[PDB]
Design a protein around this nucleic acid. Sequence first.
RNA 1: CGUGUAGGCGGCCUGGGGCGUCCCAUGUGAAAGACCACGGCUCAACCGUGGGGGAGCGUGGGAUACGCUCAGGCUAGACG
RNA 2: CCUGGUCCACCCGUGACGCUGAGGCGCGAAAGCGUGGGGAGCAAACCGGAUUAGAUACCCGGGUAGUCCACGCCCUAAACGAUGCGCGCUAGGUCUCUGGGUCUCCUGGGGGCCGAAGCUAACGCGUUAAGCGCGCCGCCUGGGGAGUACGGCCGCAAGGC
Lengths: 150, 234, 138
Amino acid sequence: DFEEKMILIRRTARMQAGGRRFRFGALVVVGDRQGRVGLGFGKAPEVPLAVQKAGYYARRNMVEVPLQNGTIPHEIEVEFGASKIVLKPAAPGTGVIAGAVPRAILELAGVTDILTKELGSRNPINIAYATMEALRQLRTKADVERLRKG
Amino acid sequence: VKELLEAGVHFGHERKRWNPKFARYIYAERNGIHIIDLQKTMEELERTFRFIEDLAMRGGTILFVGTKKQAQDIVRMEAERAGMPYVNQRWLGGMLTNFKTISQRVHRLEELEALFASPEIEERPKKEQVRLKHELERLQKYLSGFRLLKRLPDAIFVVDPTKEAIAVREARKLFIPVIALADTDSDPDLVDYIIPGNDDAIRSIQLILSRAVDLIIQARGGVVEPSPSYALVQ
Amino acid sequence: MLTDPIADMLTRIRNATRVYKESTDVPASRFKEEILRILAREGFIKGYERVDVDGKPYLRVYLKYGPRRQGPDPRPEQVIHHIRRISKPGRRVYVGVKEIPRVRRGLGIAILSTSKGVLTDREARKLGVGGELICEVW
RNA sequence: CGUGUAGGCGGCCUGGGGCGUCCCAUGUGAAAGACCACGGCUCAACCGUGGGGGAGCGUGGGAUACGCUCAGGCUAGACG
RNA sequence: CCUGGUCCACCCGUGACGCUGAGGCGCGAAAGCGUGGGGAGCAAACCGGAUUAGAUACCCGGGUAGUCCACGCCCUAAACGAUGCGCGCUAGGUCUCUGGGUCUCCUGGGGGCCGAAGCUAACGCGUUAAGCGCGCCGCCUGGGGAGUACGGCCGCAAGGC
Ligand SMILES: [Mg+2]
Ligand SMILES: [Mg+2]
Ligand SMILES: [Mg+2]
Ligand SMILES: [Mg+2]
Ligand SMILES: [Mg+2]
Ligand SMILES: [Mg+2]
Ligand SMILES: [Mg+2]
Ligand SMILES: [Mg+2]
Ligand SMILES: [Mg+2]
Ligand SMILES: [Mg+2]
Ligand SMILES: [Mg+2]
Ligand SMILES: [Mg+2]
Ligand SMILES: [Mg+2]
Ligand SMILES: [Mg+2]
Ligand SMILES: [Mg+2]
Ligand SMILES: [Mg+2]
Ligand SMILES: [Mg+2]
Ligand SMILES: [Mg+2]
Ligand SMILES: [Mg+2]
Ligand SMILES: [Mg+2]
């Protein structure tokens, strides 16, 4: 059990002789605020269901966010295909400045100080994936020089 | 004793249908065939066993997989001869990755296993008898060895990893350690513990399945003679 | 005909590692040395030796990568994830010492030539100098 | 689609110059505003004082890796 | 007969003499224009027969330019790989053209297919990159208005830029 905030829900649809059917989708983030965050996309014949599935994959696919003073170790850009993201660490006592997606994630990421910017496609979904893969790709003075042993 | 064994008739396979990643594992191309370097297969058969041993003796089960007619039976043996889960038939997908559910088919084998020996058969029209029978038949056909442990195998041993790569994927997506006997036909990189050698002629298959299932029980006690292999073996 | 031999090297390197490879051989030069002599001194390579391929003097450069990995795509993390040249041949970039970049928040290096040798972001700041910001690595 | 004028871009080594480039010093960069402090009006706006900076540019000295120039060599480009 | 480019082999010569390239110049399918030939087949236009509500079409019978040639213009195109050029680097599999070798094999240039890694919105690309890099040129900046108007230059004109 973690935080579990729900990024967005959408009613998609497909055609077929007679009429149009539907389906709902769910981006959901999840966190303890100790540096453990999870993103999950859930689609199901019903709104309630979808969100359920959301948390489930979320709890399945999470990542260690190497905080520091409540912020982030270093700065990063990440393109996920079309949608880019800027993560830049802020001094103690700034605030988490980002759009619904990158914040909603970064909040339960346990961050507080972090400058950010969406770029390229601002597709929620695709920004989401960006935000994670960004995080994932974070390093600390530690695990850095850990690779520069010899 | 190993050198003379393998080198005897159990090395060098696939030719020019290769895959460049399998380079550090080759001596040359004789008469067209790719002849793997055996001297390294030792150093690798070693480390592999180093892993088997340090698992056999820590009481963790190993899933065996082979679906090719050149190596099906010779695994159904070494598996029963180790009392380990195995897969002889069509390695159905998601068996590991979607365990909870494929398992529900096992709980259907025993749903019929117990409604085999029973007085409920005095009834059931000739319809359900042909049906429920057939249903147990195939259930069995594919799940003879996929019962054993109702838990995620601590690792998996496999013949041609490029053949049942589907499997390898499942294991890989679950972090389940993977050992397998791959040749040039197979890409090394994606195998945790690597057995570089023939993957078709029943020769090399028995030689590495044997001494693998042999080194299995040699961490439980009960050293025996080799297992059923020759019956029409060439 | 190679316009900027370095951004070549720099790329040779970059390219070799994407597939993870023993070494690779930038054609040699005292400056390509000097630069390499810092990737290694800073722990991005194992190092490098001088070699030959038909009287032609290159630089065997031994790459460094991470530990294997569990899960799918067990391919190692990179010791050199990112390496992109600055101060290019079609647009030299220079810098005063106060103008010197603070790569990746300390986690990175900004190699750069100067009048007192090919320093680094810290080496320059400390030595109190600037010059042709050669490239950024991390 | 070619050809090529101007221009932009320039392989390996040695040395001279030191134009770019880098550092130091000094002059300049008025004040007012801005910014950091301090106080003056009951606060504040306004307002006084003090400090700290500003790329630029002139001058003097220094550095010589990279760029330029001049000089010598090489043959992996190119040409024959 | 005259002549261009181009690959290979020997490592001989020159010693960076390179790459790109605004303007400029040259070339530039078809149709089209001028002068003069040529004219069988085909064939815009045009004439008839059908079809058709009509049929200034599709199908049929005819037929002039033109299609050919020489010389001079015109300078456009789905002028297409809709992919500027040069160079370095980044798995292989396969068949194919054409070179060289102490020729079941290797190596060099070219043309295809499948595909590592990687790029990609996807489709796909992938040592013939749409990968990873540097140089230089060209070009884009919502649709229609419109490649229109005006001006300018070019052209006999059509018309082009
Ligand atoms: Mg992009
Ligand atoms: Mg020129
Ligand atoms: Mg000077
Ligand atoms: Mg002032
Ligand atoms: Mg000479
Ligand atoms: Mg040219
Ligand atoms: Mg023409
Ligand atoms: Mg014509
Ligand atoms: Mg005419
Ligand atoms: Mg007709
Ligand atoms: Mg006719
Ligand atoms: Mg075409
Ligand atoms: Mg065009
Ligand atoms: Mg061009
Ligand atoms: Mg070819
Ligand atoms: Mg292809
Ligand atoms: Mg190829
Ligand atoms: Mg238009
Ligand atoms: Mg027009
Ligand atoms: Mg006009």
